[PDB]
Symmetry: D3
Subunit: 330 residues, 6 copies
């Protein structure tokens, strides 16, 4: 089938759903990759090497969304793309439909089959396509948190790792998840005195192991938390699905309250497309139909099909007819 | 004696010439410490700190400059500060007089004894009070270069240390010097693929030793510098492909005042020993019994003593060893 | 029962099926260990300490294979040993019968009960007795790959870790398995700039953790692969169950194409006998009979019994009557 | 010649002035090595070791002191050992004569040529034979401070490096010196949160470099020392809140003889080269062709040569360069 | 319900069943925390911050054991506390009843409901509340073992990490469990040449990974063991549910034979109360009744209830009527 | 001027006296760079590299030696190369003239100005151009010793770093020198249990510091060396039980040309600065304004200047300071 990779049109979005690496496997494996001119240009990928790997570069998004059996995207269709949604195609991308009835409706109103990146889940309840983004995000939280600590940024005026004879910043990472673990790693590498708080003692246990006790760990509690933040020069909320610190101290969620992987497209594109690669294939090969019964992880992401809503949590958050996944998969 | 420290007026300057530690060691040797209200507020040293430490918190600058037998600054007196200078006062701060004919004149026409932080020099030819600024400046370059590397800062869009399975950023530091060693250190801690360039292979060996091979080294030929700079994401000038960031420390960018809370201690921790030799024995005694301090002396009783600053502005030299 | 450890007679084979350590537990636990003179001499083990631990040193292989209830071996019997295979004994060793009908036939034609080292498997599908060999192998791939990089060896003429101001080799490890992980470890320790490629992102994830990003990881793809090898000074195929690189660059599988734990017997003997120890015991204690129903991992290795073929994959690769394992175990 | 080593009689001293290695390099240059039976038993060097190495194992001390042309000790002759001293003997050991008028007299009234381990000195002003004792002394302080930190030792009740989720211990080492560097090293390896204080910022940089930031550094102001010491669990004096432990190396505690097996080699490994220059050429030749050894010479033919030890006990000085 | 935290009265016991952290969650979550004056004072916790977090400080132990719905303790009641055991309360603490019929009887004779800290077990058979103690213990074994190596302590007279040009001690850790892993970590950090012996090759495998082969590993055997201890300057028995070494060499179990987390209360109190926190809550919230059927891990710790013995192993070790856990939980 | 580099003819030599970087910095100072076709092919520097860099690729050696005002080599002219030498030519390369009476004569009878790489010497008594060869030589010894340790190489049959649960290899490096430090470094990275021996305890401390205790150190007594060497698997001579491998760098084995791609840059990166002082000012000027270069001068206008090479072959000395 002819797969399509259109140019992300959303605001401040410079990523691309595929790399010359994935495109190269689609091609030399029996498929046709329709890539829109400049789609990857935004994350340092010209069509020069996109073609030197296999890319049926086309001029407009119209031709891309058309003749493309599988449309790989990074973000969900925006306003002007609704009139694009085909019925005989498969939309594989980040949807957050429970965040857009308008979006959800347009996918049902167009009867297109779609799979949401964020809900593809494996056995241990893991979310593979979100993992990379959490990694990119957490490492960024630190680089961004460190910069905003500059007095010029309205920060306290403290250097992440100080200098000889002078103390470094005291960084607090709330949570030892992918993001919390990656945030501490960088802040620590930059020289800050990082302490990570979690309620899960095994996560804290391995952090002690990983940095021979260099990255401090404190059992997380509302009392420990409040205590740790008072002292903190920078705090990172790495806890992913009302209280304050000192003047000049920074707060980065995932005083200057700061608030992503779009910031580093080259990186993030690869990070995600590498996680996406195996599924895009299972899709391009045997179709979303055989791809979802042969793989309950990719299936768990099914979002819509010919006016069908295949996600209860969403049909719940908005109150709409739920159409069991098992049934639309025969 | 009484030493005074006025709040810096230089726009965008957040450092202070003394910390609660210094304003506590002078107070212990029989000295009255005068500090302007709000002197170290921009570097997190409230008057409370300076106060309950033995320091006298005067209302404004006037009171500081009037009394202060020795005055401690970070930057030199700026334009609107020329009327403050006193004949019988010892000014201690970064002067860079060889950069402003206007500054030099005010101190000269002033008859003030000023000693420059940046020219103070020990035996090995080291600049003690200027070295801590190169440490901060070196670490900052990396934190900053990593920041402007973001697509949204004009940068290419590369995370310093990538993420598993995805290639890390390519950093090139030119100079195995004090600042370069700091940039590579931090850039390396961010996960980045760092390489340092230098024609001093002795420095290449200690960097090889320290980071045990993780931070790459390349003899600095103009051939490699070019090739190295062609492939990089961030190049740090501690002595280009589209979107690369070049930070130059002396997308583009060309500082220790950005992190005042950090650099105040760094500078005043180096300055402290001299501020002491000055508060106890005078500029004459101090500078007499200490050559490194002697080398910083810039002006006194109308004289301009400096073969670099003097053979710059076309002025009469004065053997600093004479006034000594 | 009297266990027997004969001298490996195969070519270039200097290993031994047991160490004074294991022999010491066989003895002071109720059994008799019949070790052939010089059996361990080949891997730095004289009979001096073999007896100082418990060893009924005997002169020839004939007496060893005879009176020995359990014959522990490292390699499969060769030409002259066929006339040795008893019917009332147990052959526990590496067989690769699917690689030798002649060998397989001789074990059936002699009606001997045997268990193959390479097919003993645990729950997570793991192969314990092969693990150590993969470790030895991978660490060797690097030491051997580094030596063959010497211009004198016909190599490019590059030192693994270069010297101050000069660049090290660029080493590529294909695969993050036991072997791939161990290969990167040594090459990295030797100073090379190693990059490991894998399709399994968790393996890459932990390699980043283990060396704080010092050992580079790149999602493995046929495009990434080809790209990585072009640059490479040395490449190690650590992928265990047609394209080229630069002149002088080395290739080591598991330009100079090089091709094992027999290379370092002292090491490998211990490596394997340590993994073998627990089973040899379960065998020597309760017999292969009770040893295989009480332990499905050791049972999964059963190969033959009194003319019986207890391994389908083998009976398949050669087309021969398959005799269900469950049945020959009552 | 023949060099002799007697068992130390100083109570609680377990070191020996020579190891099987030294008693084997002298034996190879045509020297008879006499060692008392049981000399190095308290540091794990049985007579078997000393014996099957080329050493002569005499019955007791008398035989050692009588024969020994050069005598090697660790501590100085104690009270009951004054009758042992010989006019024509070279005593080599830690003497601290400037601490005992009584000791100095026995060697003086003795006419013995004694050379002090602690005053021997090379160019850079280093004390070669005294340095290894500061390494051991530094590492011991941490092992000990970590021990007395236990509630049952009077200490507060803190594990040096805590455990995951629980805060680690706070260690403060005062002095970036040889001993301080060792304490921080070990205290840091125990998981503890270590900080070193010093007014020598050059030492602060090498500690920063070495442990790459894990061991904290703070310019030693009397202000920080206090604040630092106020928050600590264990403070090590290598130059307080309830239950804190302060170890002072020169709950409280104020040494290399505690781990004799370790420190014997450390000391005798530094001493060895000199014991050789002494056994081959004599105190005269050796001390002549080697200034560092010349600096250790303390007594000879009744003379007391030392501007520190002499201007202490009120005695006549003797130009060591004269007797040379 | 009103929870109670009494002052440990046992000998040389300076720990406390709760920290201002846990007490803070009990309070600002709907409960009343009755803490006895000075209960925490012994492990550096005054009532100053105990109240500044929420503590109904009371004068005597009598009032504490009274009006307290849940009595959190570190150690089992001693002689004078028997007359304290209420019937309408819950005793959550370390019991070791199989070590005290007197103790066991008193809990049955008082009909109190109790849950033993040491038998709360999770799915992978893990014992969470013992883990922290094993960590504290193992790290101590090393600090204590290193001190007792001092000739003054009657030891051989060897410094853990020697000094330049001179060798460090040779430390042997028997077992790679929590305690064995933590013992090696510290001894190694102190500079000793540590070698860890285990029969479980995965534990040895990860120790190699964790310290890049710096902490030596040797497959554990009675022959390897005896060999390793001969050389050893210090040995730590980290193997938790008759042979000798050199003169001056130390032995620490978990020559100077030495024989705990009470040694470092500040540490250990937090270590354990952090592990205890989640259960104390599940208890204080829904009662031991709903707390044990909703959580089979905490339930597996049930020890007694109104004259009932809810632990077979104990009723076995002493021979007493066993009263099935499932039945006393409806 | 024009500097020339001929392909090495010495059998088994794969290094080249100049890299594309050097042949690019000389070309920038107005110099014609002549390089023989295939000069750096054995070290991966095709003529393409040398070409598109500013270098003149001559057909063969004749053209190189004829023109070249300064000639750069790695090894000295061998037998069949004696007819190439020119009176008015500056030869720069490793000469070891004090090793071949025959070599010395050809340069002497030649009237050529030759400067030896190995005798060039800076203040600290360091041999700049010879040091990089000891780094390579040190790392190679370990890679090689680890290789010949294989049962199939005659070795004992030990993997350098063992495998979990199995004991690692025992490495002994004799010499804390530049080469020894490199061998221990690499041998340690291979997982091996490394120990370094030296009578210079200062070097023992930096190795202790660097690898923080993982690489063992032992004072070099002849007693320990023996005991140490008795227990080893691989001993590296950077200054035996059956199957042990002893590599000696100056089963047995007694080098930088083995990894030409690496060592060419290493040597030419050190040589480069001198090749420059030579191409710009001449052997006279260069050697004049630079003592380290002055120390390398070996022959000129028929003279043989060297108190080591001259008092070897029984020849007349010529004050190098005279011809200067």
């Amino acid at each position: 089938m002819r797969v399509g990779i259109p140019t992300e049109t959303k605001n401040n979005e410079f990523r691309v759903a595929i790399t010359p690496a994935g495109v190269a496997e689609l091609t030399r494996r029996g498929h046709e990759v329709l890539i829109q001119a400049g789609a990857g240009e935004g994350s340092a990928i010209t069509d020069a090497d996109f073609k030197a790997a296999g890319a049926q570069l086309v001029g407009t998004a119209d031709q891309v969304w058309a003749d493309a059996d599988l449309l790989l995207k990074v973000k969900e269709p925006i306003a002007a793309e609704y009139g694009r949604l085909r019925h005989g195609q498969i939309l594989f991308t980040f949807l957050h439909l429970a965040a857009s009835r308008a979006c959800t409706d347009a996918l049902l109103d167009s009867g297109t089959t779609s799979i949401a990146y964020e809900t593809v889940q494996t056995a241990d309840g893991a979310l593979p396509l979100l993992a990379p983004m959490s990694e990119v995000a957490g490492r960024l939280a630190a680089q961004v948190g460190a910069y905003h600590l500059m007095r010029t940024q309205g920060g306290r005026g403290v250097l992440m790792g100080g200098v000889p004879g002078v103390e470094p910043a005291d960084v607090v990472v709330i949570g030892a998840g992918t993001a919390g673990y990656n945030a501490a790693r960088i802040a620590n590498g930059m020289g800050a005195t990082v302490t990570v708080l979690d309620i899960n003692i095994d996560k804290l246990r391995q952090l002690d192991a990983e940095f021979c006790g260099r990255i401090h760990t404190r059992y997380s509690s509302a009392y420990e938390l409040e205590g740790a933040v008072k002292r903190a020069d920078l705090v990172i909320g790495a806890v992913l699905v009302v209280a304050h610190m000192k003047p000049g101290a920074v707060l980065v969620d995932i005083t200057l309250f700061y608030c992503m992987p779009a910031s580093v497209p080259k990186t993030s594109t690869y990070a995600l497309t590498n996680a996406t690669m195996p599924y895009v294939l299972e899709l391009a090969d045997h179709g979303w139909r055989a791809a979802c019964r042969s793989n309950p992880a990719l299936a768990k992401g099914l979002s819509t099909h010919e006016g069908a809503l295949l996600s209860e949590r969403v049909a719940t958050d908005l109150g709409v007819p739920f159409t069991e996944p098992a049934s639309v998969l025969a």
